[PDB]
Amino acid sequence: KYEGDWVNGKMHGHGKYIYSDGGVYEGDWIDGKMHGKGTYVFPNGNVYEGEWAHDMKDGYGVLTYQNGEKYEGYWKQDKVHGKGTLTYTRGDKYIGDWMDAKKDGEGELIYANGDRFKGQWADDRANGFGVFTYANGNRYEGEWTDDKRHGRGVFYCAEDGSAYEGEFVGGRKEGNGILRLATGHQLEGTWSGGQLVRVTSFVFA
Amino acid sequence: KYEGDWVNGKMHGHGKYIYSDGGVYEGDWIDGKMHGKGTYVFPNGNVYEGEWAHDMKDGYGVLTYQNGEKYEGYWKQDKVHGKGTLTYTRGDKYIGDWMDAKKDGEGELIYANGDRFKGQWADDRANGFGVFTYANGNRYEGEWTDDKRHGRGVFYCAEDGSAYEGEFVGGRKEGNGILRLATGHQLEGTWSGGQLVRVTSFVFA
Ligand SMILES: [Zn+2]
């Protein structure tokens, strides 16, 4: 069903269209394709209000999911792409680069609880250098692989004023590391499974 | 206004009463006083459903506040008193002893975020020995004054597997303390404002 403007033999102008699956589009048409600005209500409850080109979401658009989520940002050919903000169901926001619907490039994750992250992303996960700052003041800085602390990094416990500098495997302190205390002293040791299992030396300030 | 049972010259039996301030009571009456079981709707929106003696809340009763809170437990002469559970607006529960509407005696505070406390209370605040366990695994054990860590105590950081044993002032590590690490080594030092400001010695396992 179509209720709107016709030009030549195509839908062209403004009009509402009801799709075979039950979706509904109201907005701009050009040569029989969704093109310009219009809103689209999906059978699953998702709603898109934004810009279309050649029957696809393209340009700036807002997708209010029914599962509570909400994306505001840029699209190319029906996939989020470029700069955009995802507000998760429970308040957390991602703000940064997207590629083919995946977080890829540079981005922030601002959590509701006060925590905050900024770093490199790839394949929808933290991959590369990034800083995680907790609300209490704890902070990680270093390499990430697959959303986990992984590689060379520094973790600072704001409670004790101390900092670990060493390797991380799968989000856990692993191997030979340095433990710097607030007073400047260091402890060289070996970590396994994120736990200090052997102290080898005590270095002075 | 009263709508209910009369015996002799007093309200006696079951009946509804509307008070000059707008409160409403439906329930049991004995010799013209609220006595037995009945619910009372307050002008401010608070509702009490429970037990009364001699015109006062006395026995077991539930007070659903309008500000979201909710007390389930025991009353004596219109004040919470004895064992009772307070569910705070945002999920936190106190479960333990009350005296004259104040937390006093032994009690738990089960927080929504996973944290948990149990210890001695006085004048509505933690006073005496008590253990605080955080969701991550951090743990305090020792003395409390006025809802704050205060006196001799032990604080364990589950991240670093380390533990501070020393004095606390106003919830902050203060003075000469011992810093025990997971491997058994200790660091004797001085803390000021919760921060390690001088390391005096390094003790072996
Ligand atoms: Zn720590």
Numbering used by the authors:
A (entry chain A), B (entry chain A): 149 to 353
From the publication, what sentences describe this entry?
High-resolution crystal structures and biophysical analyses of a truncated form of the TbMORN1 protein and its homologues from the parasites Toxoplasma gondii (TgMORN1) and Plasmodium falciparum (PfMORN1) enabled, for the first time, a structure-based definition of the MORN repeat. All three structures are antiparallel dimers joined via their C-termini, and, when possessed of the correct key residues, can adopt extended or V-shaped quaternary structures. The crystal structures confirmed that each 23-amino acid MORN repeat is composed of a β-hairpin followed by a 6-residue loop that connects to the next MORN repeat. The structural studies presented here make a case that one conserved function of MORN repeats is in homotypic interactions and possibly also in higher-order assembly.
Although TgMORN1(7–15) was predominantly found as an extended dimer, a V-shaped form similar to that of PfMORN1(7–15) was also observed in the crystal lattice. The two V-shaped dimers share the same coordination sphere of a Zn2+ ion, which in TgMORN1(7–15) is provided by the Cys305 and Asp308 residues. The latter residue in turn interacts with the Ser310 from the other subunit. While the salt bridge and anion π-interactions are also conserved between the two V-shaped dimers, the aromatic stacking present in the core of the PfMORN1(7–15) dimer interface is functionally replaced in the TgMORN1(7–15) V-shaped dimer by a series of aromatic stacking interactions at its vertex. The coordination residues map to the β-hairpin of MORN repeat 13, which in TgMORN1 and PfMORN1, but not TbMORN1, contains an insertion of a glutamate residue—Glu307 and Glu308, respectively. Taking part in an anion π-interaction with a phenylalanine residue (Phe303 and Phe304, respectively), the resulting Glu-Phe pairs effectively stabilise the TgMORN1 and PfMORN1 dimers in their V-shaped form. Moreover, these very same glutamate residues further stabilise the two V-shaped dimers by being involved in a salt bridge with lysine residues (Lys321 in TgMORN1 and Lys322 in PfMORN1). The residues in the crystal structures of TgMORN1(7–15) and PfMORN1(7–15) forming the Zn2+-coordination sphere and anion π-interaction were taken as a fingerprint for a V-shaped dimer. Based on the crystallographic data, the apicomplexan MORN1 proteins appear capable of forming both extended and V-shaped conformations. MORN1 proteins in Apicomplexa have been shown to be a key component of the basal complex, which undergoes a constriction event at the end of the cell division cycle. It is therefore tempting to speculate that these extended (Zn-free) and V-shaped (Zn-bound) conformations represent the pre- and post-constriction states of the MORN1 proteins in the basal complex.
